[PDB]
């Protein structure tokens, strides 16, 4: 039967019971020992309340806000007898503030995004840089510098960000092995960064193709997705953003850097969900992805940075999302951007509504001697239904990653604020893999210059096919 | 009963029997008196042959080519006893050469596109300008100058190009009434151009939204459309192209004009089916259209050009397509452009396969005192099935326009080479209207600057919402 990894000796407070909370709850119940009355879900939605009631779990129907979060969460997380676990799977709440509160009170913490308090993403007085995931991530890095060590809090540990950081490490090990390079696997950040440098990894796409399809066609004026519509649209309207590689020799006129922080990022002055990049996955082959900002675009590039003695970056990979969401989401973006406003309504596809498909999610490492290598999960909806309830394939990759991070945090409970890049990738993948379906590594000879130039002039760099100049879709 | 407009006494030579030929044949049989044995259908495909054989119509299984067209077509066109009618609904054939051959032999002629001989659309030695619909149309204008008058040949008389020219005239009449502009209805090209100028029509979109949906979801690696896949992809890979208004104050860096010809056009050095424009239809409301090149973008702008005594253009409207095809076609374009190559397979949706939807096809006249006015057809698939066989709503708008043009040609058989803009629009609409479903005029206060500027800096012209600078979507 299913492994029970650890006892949780305190309250389990799940903030948010949307598509990810609904998929994560059964995994927590399955894989951890605790008295049932220890678990409580907090979500303002009536829909969520009804589902929670049907699942027999405690539910508090309340929005967590800047004004109530201390009064609500401190008693809940400290109810005892020992250390609780805040499992934050919400929108509209501050990851930073909730994380800090959990830490101050000795509770473990995990989330899947650096979310801000409601109001931030559309605040007209914020400059684009301030709305970037680079800037949100810097608040977490600052919190870590301010209070090193202490109770473990895991930032951005879903499928992506999250699992994909573990895939990058496995992909690097595999690339080395496939070249006949043997020996000790890297242990330290610096060693991982040098492995990427030494292997000639110029950049990495988080290369995803969701092929899940519903039993009904996309309704007019309804945004359809396989996970948070609100969350997808919010990140989609943030600036396009990427970890920026040392090999790059061109950026768009509307690209901008940052004065401060880890140094690994640029952003573009346009919304990422209306920015296209040329990319590739094994099932899609060549496809457009949307250049939607993601925490790991920065965190992976930062993690794999090699600096010289003076502290100057001398190697860093480009890293960004290249997302092809489900067909109905593609249509939803075309509708939304074409209308200039959010649809009147939205819906998230339930497993009962999905007729077939997979969430093909992996990392595409390029520029090395074998050109490009994609490593990741090809989890299908049919396998999903066999192995975990109340979610689709998109959901299960995320919920199983939260499970893995929770196991890691319980096993390493004094590690301080950590990113997915800081965790033991082998342990995390050991926990997660039973929920990932086929996990495969595939080489390809495809590059962004395949078939180009066509019959129109274009600005391309034929000396270096994977340059962002060639990847970015431009007029 | 259905009106039988005229007897056709000579051969009826239908070149091509794909979606439009299949929809047009039954209308020809319905609306003209003739011995069925005088029909002949020419198409290279087995699929077409079996359909023709099922209708008990003479069929010749040949591709018409530059090498064979004279020897193949002349005996068919001249078989007698009376004047024949060449109904050209093909791909890969020269409209110009076939039209000239028909005229040389006294046969009436109609088509729905200025098609070139196979090889043109992908010829790598052609400069972009030479690949343009403007250039193709100029070959037709030159033929007309070289041989004025004579046997009628109707160029580009489908739904669009074709019908939409008649809609422009009706829309101008309606606007004049609604704006209280006095004067008699124009009866010459010069008078129509002056009316458009006097009404302050800055430009016109051919504003189309196809909402037809099939009973099966879009297959991976299959291009799906409601009419010619080959034809749509060919025009989609031609340069984006538009009739260019005198009111425009800006064009993109990759726009180009023409050194010769009617003077009415520009094109962009990028493919039209991967070029988006902000537009509007009554059912879509605000939407993206694709800026796919079309004959009428040039012909309507040219028709409505006012020149001074010296012959310099002092007024001309912008005119271009703003096409939102069916959702499966939108996905097909994303797939094709994302892959960098045509899909392995394609299919045209049959009425038996379509579950619901309309082809909302009209003209959006903007810049006048009531902002914007859309006039056109909202034909549904359900109405289509009630009134005509063997076609979907897209096909019926086209086949019924061909019918109208054929009636007009029989009633005006010595009018020379004519475009849809040259035909008597009321007679054509009188014939066509029974097949158009609801035909309506709708005003809107929408403009391309609605909601702008938003979250990011944009390169807009706030002085005039309808400038192309505001309409064109930048990547
Ligand atoms: N890293 C990844 O791989 C990954 C993947 C998917 C989702 N996510 C993130 O996880 C979060 C949840 O995604 P989802 O698909 O479950 O979203 P969802 O939209 O399905 O659910 C969000 C839930 O948050 C609740 N909520 C709203 N305001 C709240 C508040 N003030 N307090 C508490 N709850 C509140 C809503 O009622 C809703 O049930 C989102 O932030 C999303 O961006 C991360
Ligand atoms: N103006 C408009 O509104 C409008 C609308 C739709 C289509 N069209 C045009 O009408 C034409 C027909 O469209 P469709 O949807 O019927 O296309 P289709 O692709 O369904 O059919 C094209 C037919 O042409 C035949 N063909 C190919 N090569 C040939 C040759 N050398 N000689 C004779 N026949 C040949 C094919 O075998 C096929 O049956 C296309 O050129 C298209 O661009 C115009």
Residue numbers in the entry:
A (entry chain A), B (entry chain B): 3 to 477
What does the study report here?
In contrast to its eukaryotic counterparts, bacterial HSS synthesizes 1 mol HSP from 2 mol PUT. NAD+ serves as a non-covalently bound prosthetic group for BvHSS. The interface area of the dimer was calculated as approximately 1700 Å2 by PDBsum indicating a stable dimer23. The BvHSS subunit consists of two domains as determined by CATH24: one “NAD(P)-binding Rossmann-like” domain (domain 1, residues 3–163 and 394–425) and one “homospermidine-synthase-like domain” (domain 2, residues 164–395 and 426–477) as shown in Fig. 2a and S1. The crystal structures of BvHSS containing NAD+ clearly show that the active site is localized inside each subunit.
1,3-Diaminopropane (DAP) is the only known diamine functioning as a strong competitive inhibitor of bacterial HSS910. The innermost nitrogen ND of the DAP at the active site is coordinated to Asn-162 and oxygen O7N of NAD+ , whereas nitrogen NAA is coordinated to Glu-237 and oxygen O2D of NAD+ . With the nitrogen NAA position being found near the inner amino site and the nitrogen ND position being found near the center amino site (shifted towards the inner amino site), the overall geometry of DAP has to be slightly “stretched” to fit the observed electron density. The innermost nitrogen ND of the second DAP is coordinated to Glu-117 and oxygen O2D of NAD+ , whereas nitrogen NAA is coordinated to Ser-236 and oxygen O of Glu-232. Thus, the nitrogen ND is positioned at the proposed ionic interaction site 2 of the “ionic slide” (refer to Fig. 2d). The other nitrogen is positioned slightly “below” the proposed ionic interaction site 1. In case of a PUT instead of a DAP, the corresponding nitrogen would still be positioned slightly below the ionic interaction site 1. This supports the proposed function of the ionic slide as being a substrate guiding mechanism: The observed electron density of this second DAP appears well defined and is not “smeared” as in the case of the first DAP. In contrast to PUT, neither DAP nor CAD have been detected either at a distinct position at the inner binding site or at the outer binding site in HSS crystal structures. Instead, only DAP is found to swap potentially between the inner and outer sites without being oxidized. Thus, DAP can compete against PUT for both binding sites explaining its reported competitive inhibitory effect.
